[PDB]
């Protein structure tokens, strides 16, 4: 088996398509998209470091010096061929991609209904990205891959749910690690309990989990942490640093994380964009302090694909540094690499277009941090 160790990204291959969508209270002009860049340097909190499809993570991982394979299905039309060509030019392994000649890539058949006086839609025919069967899996890829990566978008499709669980069994049989990068799509933000029930099985099937701060707080309690953020003492601060009215970087205790912990979880990472990387392991926990600067390039900055770069950097360091799971100092040092990768990825328009290379990421990491933190 060649080096570096292979990773597998399972799910849909799409161009852009950030899944995490919520309501923002600061909209720009509905027509003048030249104003919408001001929401890139003053983003909604859930969109600070947005993730995307697993193909973004695969491309970013390959650009950071790793070897990746994509497992999914595309149609036999022009769009599927173009997506496969884009993944191939990025040196992502395509042997796990299954073609469907009778399906239209990234197209879903829906029926519009008017239940209870409101327009609604229901899926008639699923797209080929959500129509991968367990018999179409690539067993060589699942055998070679050391990390298995997927998003919660597949949980919105029953076919992909069954295929994902079969693939997880296959990967665990061969010794691979399961990376659950949540990336909650629009439907999965409706209420906490239904999402917890929907993601419980995949959550317990994962060794590595990455969630955003908003995702974790939604999964535990949104109102409690919103109230805790808004609290201000009436008379005097409890310490001087609380007098500065600095941005809140609250580090969740493992006791608060206890509902979401299970036995096979080796590492949980909570990302507040690139600013904070809260990590939790069975033995220890902590936070990696990062930064961001999209105002350095106000006319080319774009946060799309930043979380993909962070996750790809995490996987790149995990595949080559097994001591990350057991050493806290090594874990922080290697997570600074993912912080730098996420920082660079915010400087370009387009997720795939702006994915950094390993050389640039290491250069930025050494420039930003003091030499003792390398």
């Amino acid at each position: 088996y060649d080096d570096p160790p292979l990773v597998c990204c399972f799910g849909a291959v799409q161009k852009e398509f950030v899944p995490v969508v919520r309501v923002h209270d600061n909209p720009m002009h509905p027509d003048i998209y030249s104003q919408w860049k001001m929401l890139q340097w003053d983003p909604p909190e859930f969109g600070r470091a947005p993730g995307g499809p697993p193909s973004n993570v695969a491309i970013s991982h390959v650009r950071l010096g790793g070897r990746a394979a994509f497992m999914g299905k595309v149609g036999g039309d022009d769009y599927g061929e173009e997506l496969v060509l884009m993944m191939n030019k990025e040196r992502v392994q395509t042997r796990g991609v299954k073609f469907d000649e009778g399906a239209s890539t990234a197209c879903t058949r829906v029926k519009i209904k008017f239940e209870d006086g409101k327009m609604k839609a229901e899926t008639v025919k699923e797209p080929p990205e959500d129509s991968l069967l367990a018999s179409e899996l690539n067993l060589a890829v699942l055998k070679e891959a050391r990390i298995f990566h997927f998003n919660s978008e597949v949980l919105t499709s029953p076919t992909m749910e069954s295929t994902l669980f079969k693939a997880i069994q296959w990967s665990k049989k061969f010794g691979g690690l399961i990376f659950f990068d949540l990336n909650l799509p629009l439907p999965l933000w409706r209420s906490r309990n239904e999402t917890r029930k929907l993601i419980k099985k995949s959550w317990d099937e994962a060794n590595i989990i990455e969630v955003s701060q908003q995702e974790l707080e939604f999964l535990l309690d949104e109102e409690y942490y919103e109230r805790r953020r808004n609290y201000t003492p009436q008379y005097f601060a409890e310490d001087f640093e609380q007098t500065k009215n600095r941005r809140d970087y609250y580090h969740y205790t493992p006791e608060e994380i206890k509902p979401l912990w299970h036995d096979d979880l080796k590492l949980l990472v909570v990302t507040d964009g690139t600013l904070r990387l809260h990590y939790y392991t069975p033995k220890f926990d902590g936070v990696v302090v990062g930064t961001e600067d999209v105002l350095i390039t106000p006319f080319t900055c774009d946060r799309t694909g930043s979380g993909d770069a962070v996750v790809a950097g995490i996987m790149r360091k995990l595949t080559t540094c097994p001591e990350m799971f057991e050493d806290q100092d090594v874990l922080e040092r290697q997570l600074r690499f993912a912080v730098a990768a996420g920082i660079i990825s915010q400087w370009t328009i387009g997720a795939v277009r702006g994915f950094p290379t390993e050389s640039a990421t290491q250069n930025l990491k050494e420039q930003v941090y003091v030499p003792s933190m390398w």
Binding site: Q14, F17, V21, D31, K111, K118, T123, P187
Partner: protein, 114 residues
């Protein structure tokens, strides 16, 4: 005297409901977008070009998910950008496309599916 710079009109959930309920002669293309979404700028320009292409042979509308979040969730929108191609024939079924699909893809869908 001065032409408007944008041809794609922004509609509410109720207005889109009335448009879909009413009789339609040309295909209707519904865009779901948010101003905080980076990919939506490119989709906005692409749909402006498409609207210029189809002068009166198609209808291009956009719905902001920051004003119609529940409506977007009801219509099975899982992310942005998301397009809905609604055929003038009520018997047929609409097509939902996810991602920054090419302009030629939209042309093909409109020509051979609507």
């Amino acid at each position: 005297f001065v032409r408007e710079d944008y041809l794609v009109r922004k509609l509410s959930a109720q207005e889109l409901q009335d448009l879909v309920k009413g009789e339609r002669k040309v295909p209707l293309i519904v865009d779901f977008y948010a101003t905080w979404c980076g990919p939506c700028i490119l989709m906005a320009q692409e749909l402006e070009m498409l609207a210029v292409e189809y002068e009166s042979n198609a209808m291009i509308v956009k719905v902001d998910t920051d004003d119609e979040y529940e409506f977007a969730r009801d219509m099975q929108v899982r992310g942005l950008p998301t397009l809905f191609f609604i055929s003038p024939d009520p018997s047929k079924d609409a097509i939902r496309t996810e991602g920054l699909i090419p302009l030629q893809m939209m042309r093909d869908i409109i020509d051979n599916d609507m």
